[PDB]
Amino acid sequence: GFRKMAFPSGKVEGCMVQVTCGTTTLNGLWLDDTVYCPRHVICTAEDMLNPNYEDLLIRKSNHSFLVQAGNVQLRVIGHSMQNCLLRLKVDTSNPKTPKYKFVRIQPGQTFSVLACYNGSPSGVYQCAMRPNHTIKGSFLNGSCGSVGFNIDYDCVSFCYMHHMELPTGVHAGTDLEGKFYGPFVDRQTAQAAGTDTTITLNVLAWLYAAVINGDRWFLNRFTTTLNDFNLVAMKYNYEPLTQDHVDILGPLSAQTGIAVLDMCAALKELLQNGMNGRTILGSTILEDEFTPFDVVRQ
Amino acid sequence: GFRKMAFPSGKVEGCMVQVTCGTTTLNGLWLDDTVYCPRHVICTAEDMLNPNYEDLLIRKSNHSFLVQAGNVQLRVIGHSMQNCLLRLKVDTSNPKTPKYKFVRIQPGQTFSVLACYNGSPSGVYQCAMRPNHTIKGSFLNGSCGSVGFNIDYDCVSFCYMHHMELPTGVHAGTDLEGKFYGPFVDRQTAQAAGTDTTITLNVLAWLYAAVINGDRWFLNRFTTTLNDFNLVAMKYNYEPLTQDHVDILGPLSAQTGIAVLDMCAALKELLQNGMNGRTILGSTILEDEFTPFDVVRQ
Numbered sequence: 001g002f003r004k005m006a007f008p009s010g011k012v013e014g015c016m017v018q019v020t021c022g023t024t025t026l027n028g029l030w031l032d033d034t035v036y037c038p039r040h041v042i043c044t045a046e047d048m049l050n051p052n053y054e055d056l057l058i059r060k061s062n063h064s065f066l067v068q069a070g071n072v073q074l075r076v077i078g079h080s081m082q083n084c085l086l087r088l089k090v091d092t093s094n095p096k097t098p099k100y101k102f103v104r105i106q107p108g109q110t111f112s113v114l115a116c117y118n119g120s121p122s123g124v125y126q127c128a129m130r131p132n133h134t135i136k137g138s139f140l141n142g143s144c145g146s147v148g149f150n151i152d153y154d155c156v157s158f159c160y161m162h163h164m165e166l167p168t169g170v171h172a173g174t175d176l177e178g179k180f181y182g183p184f185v186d187r188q189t190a191q192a193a194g195t196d197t198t199i200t201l202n203v204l205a206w207l208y209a210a211v212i213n214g215d216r217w218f219l220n221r222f223t224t225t226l227n228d229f230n231l232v233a234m235k236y237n238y239e240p241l242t243q244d245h246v247d248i249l250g251p252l253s254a255q256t257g258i259a260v261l262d263m264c265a266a267l268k269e270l271l272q273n274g275m276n277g278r279t280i281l282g283s284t285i286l287e288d289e290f291t292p293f294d295v296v297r298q
Numbered sequence: 299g300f301r302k303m304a305f306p307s308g309k310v311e312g313c314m315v316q317v318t319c320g321t322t323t324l325n326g327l328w329l330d331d332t333v334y335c336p337r338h339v340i341c342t343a344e345d346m347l348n349p350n351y352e353d354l355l356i357r358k359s360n361h362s363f364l365v366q367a368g369n370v371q372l373r374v375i376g377h378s379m380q381n382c383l384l385r386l387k388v389d390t391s392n393p394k395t396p397k398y399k400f401v402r403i404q405p406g407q408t409f410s411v412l413a414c415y416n417g418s419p420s421g422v423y424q425c426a427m428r429p430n431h432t433i434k435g436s437f438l439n440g441s442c443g444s445v446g447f448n449i450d451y452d453c454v455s456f457c458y459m460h461h462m463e464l465p466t467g468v469h470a471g472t473d474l475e476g477k478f479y480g481p482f483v484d485r486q487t488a489q490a491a492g493t494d495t496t497i498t499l500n501v502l503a504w505l506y507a508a509v510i511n512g513d514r515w516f517l518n519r520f521t522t523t524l525n526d527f528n529l530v531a532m533k534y535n536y537e538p539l540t541q542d543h544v545d546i547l548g549p550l551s552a553q554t555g556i557a558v559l560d561m562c563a564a565l566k567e568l569l570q571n572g573m574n575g576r577t578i579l580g581s582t583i584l585e586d587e588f589t590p591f592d593v594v595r596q
């Protein structure tokens with residue numbers, strides 16, 4: 001009765017366009033009279049190892065970028081580069097543009113992803129920005145340009161644009177000003193995701209979700225200090241817990257009457273003695289892709 | 299790299315309206331000039347045990363149904379009942395109506411759910427029609443009228459409307475002609491979901507997904523007959539396997555070169571010897587909410 005929920009994708013579906021440059025097609029985002037898309041759309045098949053993007057873009061004209069919004073083709077009247085994004089000024093302003101904002105998210109935070117291919121939305125799902133700045137997405141060839149987003153009231157907050165797959169099958173991209181999450185670059189190199197860790201804030205939020213949904217078997221009578229917990233957390237590749245996290249879990253702690261450091265003693269016991277065949281909220285592992293905000297929303 | 303993916307919900311978001319009758323509010327679906335919604339919206343707070351819906355509806359007029367499409371209120375110009383649904387003819391035809399169809403799904407099949415409250419879409423997620431004709435959804439108070447759907451090309455296939463929660467926390471509803479899935483009724487009674495079972499077709503599809511995504515540890519050298527497998531399946535509360543299922547898994551069998559009855563010997567070994575700490579496609583349990591169609595789509 002508790003699961004990954006994506007935001008309704010209608011407001012973003014209206015802004016999804018196709019952007020073709022030579023032999024390469026990928027998705028872009030059309031807000032007002034601008035189309036944002038990954039700049040590597042101008043990289044050539046021969047030049048994937050060491051492209052110089054300033055160089056490749058001086059050589060382009062407006063007419064080298066085909067932009068198709070569904071049936072209707074848009075005419076480009078200008079172009080520029082912002083970090084790893086390209087900005088294409090088009091003639092028409094998108095009539096379906098929503099109230100929107102560009103935000104840079106932090107590790108642990110979650111968002112919905114609209115997976116698109118050739119400008120055509122195909123799927124929506126929820127995921128989290130990992131601590132190693134990758135995302136565990138479901139992106140196939142030509143998903144580049146797909147965006148990730150959160151919706152509050154009527155206001156879309158774009159936080160991610162997809163650029164590339166890394167060798168482990170996870171994914172890298174940028175915010176909507178083109179700055180990458182993590183130390184990744186939009187070329188073919190030998191770059192790997194660094195070692196990942198488990199998002200302690202999110203596990204604790206989930207245990208509080210489980211308690212609120214009536215499952216309570218993992219609770220215990222013990223307490224722990226923050227330092228005592230962080231020694232167990234380091235052994236099990238979990239992010240250290242901070243006072244800031246303890247503060248964030250306040251409202252959840254009040255609702256259930258279970259002190260945060262009590263919940264931490266509970267989690268520490270789970271990490272040391274396994275789950276021995278039981279299930280939490282339907283899971284047999286410790287979920288770390290729900291935030292404190294996500295749990296309250298559900 | 300493989301997960302629950304919902305269809306993009308934009309085409310259904312445009313048809314979500316609010317329907318108020320007295321003290322009760324719930325969601326409805328506005329296609330053309332008709333609004334479909336659960337008939338129990340006319341049930342009164344006093345009459346939940348034994349309402350007579352023919353009786354309660356003769357007593358209503360068009361002006362007892364408030365219909366709000368976002369800001370604008372719609373005027374109702376007629377009303378009738380189709381099984382467990384109410385049909386409200388309104389003055390305006392919905393301009394955002396998509397190409398659409400009403401279909402009745404079968405157990406094991408999956409669909410996307412747009413969770414709505416007070417006409418306002420709030421979330422989208424994927425689920426499956428269980429063999430006991432319930433759905434394991436995430437519906438809170440006033441989600442009634444939320445619909446479930448599949449999209450092919452530009453054509454929305456509405457298959458479920460939500461009506462009620464059953465005592466175990468699972469959910470019952472109807473197709474879009476108002477006929478319930480299962481033997482449930484839209485009153486407060488002592489009705490329970492019957493015992494559920496595991497969707498064997500879907501587990502086998504998932505194992506084929508796992509193989510296609512490079513995970514292969516559970517394969518073995520043995521084969522099984524269909525009858526030999528169904529004796530293990532009965533012991534573990536799994537649906538029997540039929541020739542029709544074997545036929546459905548054909549394309550998946552060809553793509554991976556693993557014969558269906560080979561995959562069944564594999565699954566039988568998983569059921570008898572556990573997973574002993576390993577993971578399939580990121581899971582430590584046997585997923586049964588992906589169809590053969592879902593696996594190919596991803």
Ligand SMILES: CC(C)(C)c1ccc(N(C(=O)c2c[nH]cn2)[C@@H](C(=O)NC2CCCCC2)c2cccnc2)cc1
Binds near residue numbers: 041185187
């Ligand atoms: C030029 C540059 C920056 C190296 C690049 C090249 C190819 C793509 N990939 C496009 O599919 C694609 C490219 N252009 C249109 N589509 C895919 C991709 O990342 N393969 C990686 C494997 C080789 C090493 C670098 C990239 C992809 C697959 C699945 C999900 N997401 C993306 C992305 C970036």
Ligand SMILES: CC(C)(C)c1ccc(N(C(=O)c2c[nH]cn2)[C@@H](C(=O)NC2CCCCC2)c2cccnc2)cc1
Binds near residue numbers: 440461
């Ligand atoms: C009149 C009738 C048919 C018995 C009924 C009554 C209440 C509702 N429930 C509305 O929330 C609701 C009702 N009208 C507007 N909202 C909820 C519901 O099922 N409680 C059940 C518990 C008591 C026994 C029967 C119903 C609900 C909760 C969470 C997710 N889904 C629905 C549904 C149907």
